[PDB]
């Protein structure tokens, strides 16, 4: 069940010593204030950054994984990325698919996130909320268990950025549908009610250290929240 394991992870003061478990078929939310390490953590779990600590992904440790294979077992979404100039949304998405074949699936995901009419339009020409959905879409197509058997982990850093209540709900359905298929979804929570309502487990970093973990309902308690935010 446990797909990823974090053993005393921490790089400089931003991210203090932290350890935990990433259980498949579950949605984990990194909860905490600004500076609390959330992004840095995610970057590690992804494999974008190296350093002090030990992370093992589905048996072998990240460090042991080859880029190529890693990309088949997990997808990463940075907090923000500059859209590639002159590149049609449909190409953007395709490039993310490990099986260009499954063309119809692309249309489905693009649809789900209101992008069927946006395909064919150059990424550098989308609005804020648009680009985001385009990115999410691209990442999902990459790791959907439907098209990719090796898909196991989906790391998302601040996904709801630019989305409206609706576009949010939209992605909620996708993510759920994803963990229901056995995917491991780890994302940095933005709204507490949200995390309470949709997350499964939930680490609560602060200053860079983990004040708590476990079921979101237990972890998101006034004592902790106060210990974390100060109110």
């Amino acid at each position: 069940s446990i797909v990823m394991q974090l053993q005393d992870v921490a790089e400089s003061t931003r991210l203090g010593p932290l350890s935990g478990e990433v259980r498949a078929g579950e949605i984990l939310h990194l909860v905490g204030p600004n500076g609390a390490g959330k992004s840095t953590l995610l970057a590690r779990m992804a494999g974008m950054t190296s350093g002090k600590g030990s992370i093992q992904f589905a048996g072998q440790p990240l460090e042991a994984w080859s880029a190529t294979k890693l990309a088949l077992h997990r997808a990463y979404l940075s907090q923000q990325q500059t859209p590639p100039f002159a590149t049609p949304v449909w190409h953007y998405l395709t490039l993310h698919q490990h099986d260009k074949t499954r063309t119809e699936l692309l249309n489905d995901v693009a649809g789900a996130l209101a992008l069927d009419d946006k395909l064919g339009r150059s990424t550098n020409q989308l609005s804020g909320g648009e680009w985001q959905r385009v990115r999410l879409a691209a990442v999902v197509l990459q790791i959907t268990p439907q098209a990719n058997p090796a898909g196991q982990l989906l790391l998302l850093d601040e996904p709801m950025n630019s989305l409206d209540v609706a576009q949010q709900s939209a992605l909620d359905k996708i993510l759920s549908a994803l963990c229901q298929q056995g995917l491991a979804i780890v994302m940095s929570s933005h709204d507490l009610n949200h995390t309470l309502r949709h997350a499964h487990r939930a680490w609560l970093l602060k200053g860079g250290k983990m004040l708590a973990s476990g079921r979101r309902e237990e972890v998101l308690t006034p004592p902790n929240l106060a210990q974390a935010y100060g109110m």
Binding site: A46, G47, M48, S66, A67, T68, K69, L70, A71, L72, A75, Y76, S78, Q81, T82, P84, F85, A86, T87, P88, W90, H91, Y92, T94, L95, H96, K100, T103, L106, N107, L119, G120, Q142
Partner: protein, 324 residues
């Protein structure tokens, strides 16, 4: 295969066709003009065998290669730096190969065969290209890179001007023609350079996968399993190679590596599997024309390719700015 895709591919194949034609047409025209005319028929005439074969042909083939190269280079650099403004000339990679050449010549000897020099040019380019990329990693910015590049360009101009004056083995002409590019003294005795271009040109034109990825952007590129560092350095080398040779062959030509790439993107060629090949063709033809005009323009002397390329370049660039 997706709908829009197959459709785009169709229009792509069309252009690669149209461009493929335009080049031959240009290849022909070039082989036929030079202050006198020599139609295909009058080619095997004691004149044709001289001009057409011993003078024109070589020169034309040089142009084609340098064009397609400078063009592709522009595409390649742009991808690497994640910036459309990336190009050999602006970033001073050409002046890099410039310095590397003059240096090889002076600190060397008039006996340095071309191949020897070309290698020194490639070095000049590589240095700059490497330094630019260093500045590209520590501080990824479109302004930074565009700033640095320009700067290194200037710095390389100094070293060049300051070394030629010192030796005095200078010729106000040779200098200007090199600084502003020109295929005036291109003979078969430089056919080793021309060949040298063919390998890379072909190889790189097939490496589209790495660039569509690369184009997505570092992280995306990486998280997608791309061997970034490899391809970055690899392309850095490929660039240095092409550019360096190009400078050695015809000096600092500019404004085909920026424009050509983009114009083709405008037409719809975006997927590198097409943009690279397209670039070569459009880059060849483009420079051929410039060259033809460069020589036929005035009878007194042969206008520096650069002057032409930059004269037509700036305009087509301004427009491209408003259009995009």
């Amino acid at each position: 295969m997706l709908t829009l895709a197959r459709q785009q591919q169709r229009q792509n194949i069309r252009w690669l066709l149209c461009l493929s034609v335009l080049m031959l047409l240009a290849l022909l025209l070039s082989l036929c003009a030079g202050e006198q005319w020599i139609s295909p028929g009058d080619w095997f005439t004691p004149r044709g065998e001289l001009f057409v074969w011993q003078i024109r042909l070589p020169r034309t083939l040089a142009v084609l290669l340098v064009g397609a190269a400078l063009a592709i280079s522009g595409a390649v650099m742009q991808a690497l730096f994640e910036n459309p403004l990336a190009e050999p000339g602006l970033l001073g990679v050409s002046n890099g190969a410039g310095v590397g050449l003059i240096a090889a010549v002076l600190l060397g000897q008039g006996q340095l065969p071309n191949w020897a020099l070309g290698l020194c040019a490639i070095a000049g380019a590589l240095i700059i290209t490497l330094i630019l990329l260093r500045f590209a990693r520590r501080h990824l910015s479109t302004s930074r890179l565009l700033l640095a590049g320009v700067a290194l360009g200037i710095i390389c101009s100094a070293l060049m001007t300051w070394a030629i004056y010192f030796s005095t083995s200078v010729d106000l002409r040779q200098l200007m023609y090199w600084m502003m590019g020109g295929f005036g003294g291109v003979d078969w005795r430089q056919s080793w350079l021309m060949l040298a271009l063919i390998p890379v040109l072909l190889w790189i034109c097939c490496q589209s996968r790495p660039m569509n990825m690369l184009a997505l952007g570092e992280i995306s590129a990486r998280q997608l399993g791309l061997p970034l560092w490899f391809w970055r350095n690899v392309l850095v080398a490929a660039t240095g190679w092409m550019v360096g040779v190009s400078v050695a062959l015809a000096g600092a030509i500019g404004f085909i590596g920026l424009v050509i790439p983009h114009i083709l993107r405008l037409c719809g060629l975006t997927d590198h599997r097409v943009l690279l090949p397209g670039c070569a063709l459009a880059g060849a033809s483009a420079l051929l024309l410039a060259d033809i005009v460069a020589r036929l323009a005035l009878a007194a002397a042969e206008l520096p390719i650069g002057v032409v390329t930059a004269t037509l370049g700036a305009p087509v660039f301004i427009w491209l700015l408003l259009k995009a």
